[PDB]
């Protein structure tokens, strides 16, 4: 369920370090190690996560209803020295 995106400088660059919903903390940040996932909506889990190269929470209005917001949990495909921020991205923030 991963999507290639590469904060929003339209260019997108959200690098892993040694509008915001949460964070990913871990080492290899893949299925070979336990990683910590913190997401607000708070849900905090430690699992054998296989994270996306560009993990995020997609945000859109359900059928263009401004009173009904929905999101896509594009963070990992399966379920500390490095971390990255999980952003809330509207499609319009990435398109021309």
């Amino acid at each position, epitope marked *: 369920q991963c999507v290639n995106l590469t904060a929003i400088h339209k260019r997108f660059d959200n690098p892993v370090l040694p509008i915001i919903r949460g964070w990913i903390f871990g080492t290899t940040l893949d299925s070979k190690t336990q990683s910590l996932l913190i997401v607000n909506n708070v849900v905090i889990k430690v699992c054998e996560f296989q994270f996306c190269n560009d993990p995020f929470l*997609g945000v*859109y209005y*359900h*059928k263009n209803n401004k009173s009904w917001m929905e999101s*896509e949990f594009r963070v990992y495909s399966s379920a500390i020295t490095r971390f990255q921020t999980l952003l809330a991205l509207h499609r319009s923030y990435l398109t021309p």
Partner: antibody
Amino acid sequence: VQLVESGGGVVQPGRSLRLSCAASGFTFSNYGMHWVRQAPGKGLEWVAVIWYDGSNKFYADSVKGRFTISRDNSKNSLYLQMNSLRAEDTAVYFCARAFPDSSSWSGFTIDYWGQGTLVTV
Amino acid sequence: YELTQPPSVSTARITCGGNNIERKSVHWCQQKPGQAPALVVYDDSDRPSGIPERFSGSNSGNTATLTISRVEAGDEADYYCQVWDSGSDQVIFGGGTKLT
């Protein structure tokens, strides 16, 4: 807005075939594109979609790992490389222009369809 | 995810069932014999330019409907129901309903 498929024909099982679609009448680089196939006597079956910048490629479960979708914005053209074709892959292949789906973050429906090209395996 | 719709319909109403389909946008395309499909309805009830006001629709509960009023002989085509499945990033098509 027009789409023209080519590269169809007759092949044997186990062999590959590359299809292409020429786009004109619109800015190709601003739209995502779909491939859809229709076996004789059957309904429409989705094959793959590619984003306008070529960064994201999604495939139907039945073709994933065998078919590759790609685009060339400079040449205003769409390609589909089909490897290891089987008898079950006999169908008319269409290229089509994607349209944003309001119920999904980056989902698409299909707006403009080409005439399609027949591939027999 | 899959859609379910009848092989054919003789105002014509074409139904498209699914699991809580209300939460998904339903789109419809019309394919005439010997011709490519064309978009008729999108986002449940919106029409693209060129489509007659005769074409309308709705989406509620576990079913969606394409309603074609004042049906003409020129409408004798295979109408397909499709949605985007965000769970697998696939376009899901129904069997297709033929009008007569």
